[PDB]
Chains A and B, each alone.
Chain A
C-alpha cells in the first residue's frame, strides 16, 4: 500500500506483491491516491524483468526516472511541470528490485496532478494446469502550492519563480549572491550543468568562511541540516537545496559555479536568531 508518514515527510509505496503473477487477486487494477507538498519525498519500490514472476513487467512511462504521466494522460518530463524536482532510480541486484525516489522542490508554483502505472499484466506463472497472469497498479499523485520561495540564487535565469534571486548569465560575470537564513528557511542555487561546481557536490562540501574558506564537509559542521542535489536534470541544469532545523551553532559558508569566463558565488549566513 501507499503510506505517507507525516513525521518524516516521506511517502512510501511497495508495488510488488500487489501485481505478482503468482498470487491470486480480486482486482486486476488498483488505484492509490497520494497528496504531496514541497520537500516531500516519494519512494516507490517496484520490480524488474529479472525478478521471478515479473518477467514481462513494465513501467509506464518507461523512462520512469525522467518522466511522469501528466494529467494521467501523456508522458512528460517531470522537470517541465515540477521545476526543480529531483529523481533517482537505483537498482538492487540482490533482490532484483528498483527504488524510485522523487524529491518535491522546496517551492511549488503550480498545483499539478500526474500518475504512474506499474503494469505486470503480461507476466505469467504456471500453477498445475492453470496459467495465472499478473496485475496492474496505478498511482495518482497530487502536488499542492509550495507556500514560500527559496531565499537563494538562480544563476541560470530559468528558475525565476523558484528563487528570490534569478539572473540570466552573461560572459564576464563575477557576481556574489548573499543570503541570510534562520531555522526552517530554505536556501539553494541553480547553475549550468557544464559549469564547475566547487567544492564537490555543494552543499555536501562547502568553503567555510570562518576558517579562511577551507573546504569542509557540511556534516562536519552541522548534523541538524537537510540537503538535496542534482548534478544534471533533463533540462541540463544543476541544483542544490539546503535547510536547517533546530541548529544552534551559527554558520557562514559559500560555493561557486565557474565557467571559462564567469564566476558565480553563493554565500550563506545561517544565524539561529535571524528574523525575517
Chain B
C-alpha cells in the first residue's frame, strides 16, 4: 500500500457522473482498509468514503451518502469511487488513502498512506 496512485478527474454537468480509481502495486494492499478524502478550495480535508479489506463493508460520509459508491478489486489491488449526481460543492481535489486496522472502528482515521490527488470539477 506504499504507492497509491489515483486516476480519473475532469468536468461534469450538475447532475452527471464521474469515476475515480486508486491503484497500489504492493501485495499488502490486501491487508489495508481503503478510503477516499476530498479537499475543497481553502477548506479542511474531509472524509468521503471507505471500504474494508474484504470489500464487503462500506462506510460513507453524510455529505455523499446516497450518491457515491465505493468498491475494490483485491486481485488487481485497486479501488474505485463511482460519483453520481455531482453537485457544485463536490468540486474538490480527491485523494485516496489506506490504513492498517486498529485503534477503534476500521474506517476511523488516522489513515496511514496517501496518494497525490486528482481534481474533480462540476458546473
Contacts and interface: CB of A to CB of B under 8 A. Distances in A.
Interface string A130-151: 0000000000000001111101
Contacts of A109: 31, 53-54
Interface in B22-61: 31, 52-54, 56-57
Interface stretch (A5-13, A62-70, A163-171): A163-171
B54 to A, nearest CB: 5
A147 B105 contact: no
Contacts of B53: 109, 149, 161
A27 B100 CA distance: 49
A168 B100 CA distance: 13
A161 B57 contact: no
B105 A168 contact: no
B54, B101, B106 pick with most chain A CB within 10 angstroms = B101
Contact of A148 (B57, B101, B102, B104): B57
B110 to A, nearest CB: 14
B102 A168 contact: yes
A12 B96 CA distance: 46
Contact of B101 (A107, A145, A147, A160): A160
Contacts of B31: 109, 161
Interface string A161-200: 1001111100000000000000000000000000000000
A148 B56 contact: yes
A157 interface: yes
For chain A, give the interface size range: 10 to 19
A167 B104 contact: yes
Contacts of B102: 157, 160, 166-168
B52 A165 contact: no
B106 A146 contact: no
B103 A167 contact: yes
Contacts of B56: 147-149
A145 B75 CA distance: 12
B57 A160 contact: no
A124 B29 CA distance: 53
B1 to A, nearest CB: 14
A149 to B, nearest CB: 5
Q: Which 10 A-B pairs have the closest CB atoms?
A: A160-B101, A148-B56, A160-B102, A149-B54, A167-B104, A148-B54, A164-B106, A149-B52, A166-B102, A165-B105
28 contacts: A107-B54, A109-B31, A109-B53, A109-B54, A145-B54, A147-B56, A148-B54, A148-B57, A149-B52, A149-B53, A149-B56, A149-B57, A151-B57, A157-B102, A160-B100, A160-B101, A160-B102, A161-B31, A164-B52, A164-B105, A166-B101, A166-B102, A166-B103, A166-B106, A167-B102, A167-B103, A168-B102, A168-B103
